[PDB]
């Protein structure tokens, strides 16, 4: 009886209800983006909900690789340290993370210090294609969405060298399914930091050449497409803020490229989580 009548609502759905079906799917209600057992976020900015989704992602990687208490883990391209902190907190392990970014490693040590875990969390500026660690120093390791900045043959061989025999390396890598055009290969360099993904058979030829066995692979491509959407929406809606922080040239490059890059990702690539084992004894 309030500001709308039934005939107004039915006429509205007669004219426009198909916009909900074109955007949300074969029904006209919410999607269950957060599982029921998940907790209610602190706030509801798109960044916070995305952040909780990231933590659940990290929980799933921990669960998959299954590091055991008292083991030492290597975070290949550790970003700003949250993944390692959660893995160490949950499994009671030591974690050493490497990254080529100074500010990133500083924020990761700041993080370890804020939680009183500088004795079990070690963050250093190192190249994954030339690790500064001995042979067989780590029980397990993971390359979470980092291999696309590196030579995969060098990074995988180096990870094989620093792993104890019988240990596992969890990999989160992308793969092309169709042949990319040259403009698409350039968007990899200009938008993010480059290296087009290899092919599926090509990627596992490199994994075999590094001396790894393959124990599992699981497609998570939808998760990459939703995250790339969350990103593109945040950039579109906050152009002024991001231009005042990162510049016009950078932001304008994202606005002009994110569309074509999303279509490329949707139609031509796949993203997966693979478990690689260094064989025991040889």
């Amino acid at each position: 009886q309030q500001q709308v009548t039934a005939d107004e609502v039915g006429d509205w759905y007669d004219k426009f209800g198909e916009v909900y079906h074109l955007t949300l799917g074969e029904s006209v209600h919410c999607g269950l983006w957060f599982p029921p057992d998940a907790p209610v976020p602190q706030d509801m900015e798109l960044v916070t909900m995305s952040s909780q989704a990231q933590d659940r992602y990290t929980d799933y990687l921990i669960e998959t690789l299954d590091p055991k208490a008292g083991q030492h883990l290597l975070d290949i391209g550790c970003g700003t340290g949250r993944t390692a902190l959660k893995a160490a907190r949950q499994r009671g392990i030591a974690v050493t993370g490497v990254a080529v970014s100074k500010e990133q490693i500083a924020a990761a040590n700041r993080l370890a210090a804020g939680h009183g875990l500088t004795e079990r969390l070690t963050f250093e500026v190192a190249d994954a294609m030339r690790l500064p660690y001995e042979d067989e120093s780590f029980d397990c390791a993971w390359a979470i969405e980092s291999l696309c900045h590196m030579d995969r043959a060098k990074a995988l061989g180096e990870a094989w060298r620093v792993l104890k025999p019988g240990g596992d390396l969890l990999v989160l890598e992308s793969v092309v399914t169709e042949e990319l055009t040259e403009p698409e290969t350039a968007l990899f360099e200009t938008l993010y930091a480059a290296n087009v993904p290899p092919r599926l058979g090509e990627f596992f030829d490199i994994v075999s050449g590094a001396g790894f066995h393959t124990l599992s692979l699981k497609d998570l491509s939808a998760n990459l497409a939703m995250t790339m959407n969350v990103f593109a929406l945040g950039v579109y809606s906050r152009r002024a803020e991001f231009t005042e922080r990162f510049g016009a040239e950078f932001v304008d490059g994202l606005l002009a490229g994110l569309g074509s890059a999303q279509e490329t990702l949707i139609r031509k690539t796949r993203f997966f989580m693979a478990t690689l084992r260094k064989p025991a004894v040889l």
Copy 2:
């Protein structure tokens, strides 16, 4: 091998924090789809959202728990995919009412295409004056539709058509702030209005219709993510939707969605409650 380590190092120094501004406290994907979920047919935003909708529907079915051979009233049934899934999964008959001829036509087409026109009935009817008798339905649900209705009439109507002891599942929004007058109007201009009630106000209505309250569970994040998915689809497909629904309609969406997203985040909450019509001992 298109870049070197130092190039990548410099890039994440200058820009790496843009991922922290958009994606969260880490720099990787979110687990938007649970691990046991099937891979979608497409990676289009609509197809991914559609699978999230169906998992949403699986959850509501699980929560209300209709038993085989029961009759369920779908208050504001849309185009009937919720009713179809509930019918296939539990072996129930479902009657859905909506005020849109087009939606009811689509829901009847759906029941015919799936050969279930004897277990799925879809009628054009008002929930605030349901034509059905008294104590006709074992359970019912109003999935995101009370916001179009006067909730006191619709909940009393739902109570009357429910057999004593059955349950009505409700997916309703509620204000936490006061709402400015421009914010109240956006409900009417963007969607089809009725500003959400207050918590105590809503449950005074729930009691006034004679319902007990069995459960309530917040789902505000699913609504904020869904509204996000909607806003992204409108933003990126403006040309297509203007050619389909007219410039005036899409322009209004482009003009209001940001402010409506802000109001939803900061002033409302969205929940799934189970109301019970008390049984006579």
Copy 3:
């Protein structure tokens, strides 16, 4: 072999309906203890009731979900076993308050007996005038204690001492009828009173303190079974209790529990709600 088939048949011919009147639509045991629960140490009603209490505590910890290194306020902490189990299971510090000197002393000795006096602090304080300062605790819970206090004051005082973004678990009763004056008095003479408010009234209080509502789940059948266990122990051990608490107290319970049981069944509900103090920005 002290019965024949004819005798057992004639017995159920004459009397089987007493089982159906007492135990339900079946003539066998109830699954009162889930299959994965351990076999109790004995079979006294009190110990079987206590194991159900611990599983009750286990479920509250699972629902509130306190994380390691946090500080939890127990509003009406009793003798502190709830605080102890939460502390042992989650690696948290717990500060419990109560207005009874005997309970706080027993709670402090429970912390000393388990060697946890440094993580468990029990003090004699009022929940409507908490002595702790603003934003002191990460989370809190009031387990069946709000019926002794002014709910508006206790909740506002719980809101003040919580850190923004923390959660308060509440186990509260609510009326569904109006309550006669003899019943409202029975609250005072049997327990320690305060008739329960109404659903919308309670949530107007919860909103008025500043809380958002995230979950509600009905646990009325649990409170009814607990109350039934309580009444059976009083009926079965009148002589024991009159020698310990005095004839006046026990007789008052004997005279009131039947009427209180009916009032609880037909006029009240009992739920567990999760209230959040809002967050930053």
Copy 4:
């Protein structure tokens, strides 16, 4: 309303009645698992019925009968157990009982939920089963063996079972020796036959030809069920005297007191899976 100091003196003097009656905490027990449904009402009889249905769900789940099989309910009662098994697993259930009332009330169930070609309820003796050898796939005697001769009934259940099928048994057993007033209380309150000893019971199970595959103690469930039964009789003495007669109620009251102590201290109650071997 009340003041704080009133509440403080109250628990200072009466708080321990809760620990004497409810346990080492001062709150509710989780008597109903969180995933269970909110009952239609809060009456002791209705809540107790829901726990009976959860009990029945669990037995079906334990025995795990398969679709298209035929199950024997030895001592079917009024047949709600047999009904829930038939709806949930798509099986046929034949129930027997020595009571014309309970078989009548069970046919009252086979009628409505339109089955009759699946369900079945007959007045028969378990120690004298009328059925043909090797006719069933599974069976169960749910709290019923205490009215019969366990040796005859179990041998009779073995004969009617196909080789390879399973017999679920919900039986009680003594852990002490039992005095004569206790053994008589078994006959005057219920319908008698004192429980055997554990090794004794399984010598019988072996003698009928059964292998043992499982055993699980449910004695806390029987103690709670008997506490609920006691509370109902205590609170409704006038109602049950107006129905069953004063003789019944008076004997119940006296026996119930000095029977709960014997059940708690001298008996155990369990669910056992017995198998008829299949070479």
Copy 5:
């Protein structure tokens, strides 16, 4: 009948044989999960069959065929996998195999269960499927791809699948290079075709047009099954020579041990889910 200072003597001398054979403990292995049912007997072939059925269940759960769909069983054997899938998911299953004896046994099995309308079994070659383009919703090749040209079989599976359907594949792959005697053993013992390599196999998968959604190693199940098979042949040489001829059995006896070592040290066995893309 024995004493302590006699059992300890025994373990002082031989306890190491328990560790050499069974592992780092001296007790049983949990070979059957605690929720599995007791087998009908304890013969090795039965316990292995129950594991085979639980294996089938896992494949059903993995591919997840939905009610009303049509499933192609590429290399269906004698059809028990097709039977369970049809009964459990309400689907239609068409299975092909190049063995006339197996297909006869599979249609015989379908007739005995009354499912000849939902179970079709034909003699055909998976490298030359006679079926129409986009005829099946889903498909699976259970341990059959080692008898085929995997490029011809996967492209032909890709053609007969509807766009968006899934193909479950159970395949082996080498991790070392293999000597010539080992490659020969593949042909003489079983029906041959040495497994490809990992990137080589997925070059084939991508070339047929399949996207790869999952891969899961099951190599221990294959090695444990190969041992159960070898122990069966070792134990019943006389029985198997009387039915399959001395030439066949002596070949298995002379090659099983070396083939086991090749399997252990040079090959891995996985379940993988391949999707035909939908546009």
Copy 6:
């Protein structure tokens, strides 16, 4: 590469060897649950050892020892079961055995894992335990009662157990009568004592003062372990003769098949939880 026609004729002749050895299907058995980790190698000893550890994890889960308790391992072997229990549950374990070598290997294990303060391994007899009355909160006898006088062992375990504590027992029991040659094979192959009967065993359990809280058949697990053991002895006759002597190995090769049949046809093996009643 081999062709189709050849594969067809191959299964036409040799197909049924799989249904005779592997079961009603022609594929792998799910010997390892899907959530189990991939073993380090594929040797039969390593896969069996992983099965042994999941077995231990199950016994731990079943007895459910709580942090800070003291467990008595009766017949503790070389200590890995005690180590896993101490690591997972944060408990102290005391294990006894009559074998000096085994105890030395367990004290070795405690030292290497730095758990000598929580792990104690001593040479003692379960039928004459040296510990005081009511010393341990729980205990378990994992496949070791077969070496002892079960009456003496159980009553002894009862004495050292605190009231209310539990004893996990993994015992076998005869279902047939056993010929005298089979009884002798118990003594010569292992270290003897024929198993008791089901009612006999529980007359002892009750004679020792224990209540029975559970029983679960695990016969398939023991039977498969005995097959794993037999295959290993068969396949490594040369290595084991060079290690333990020809006399011992020839005895195993002569008796293992007969013992296998006896175990399959005449005995069952189960896990039972016994409780010392509380006061």
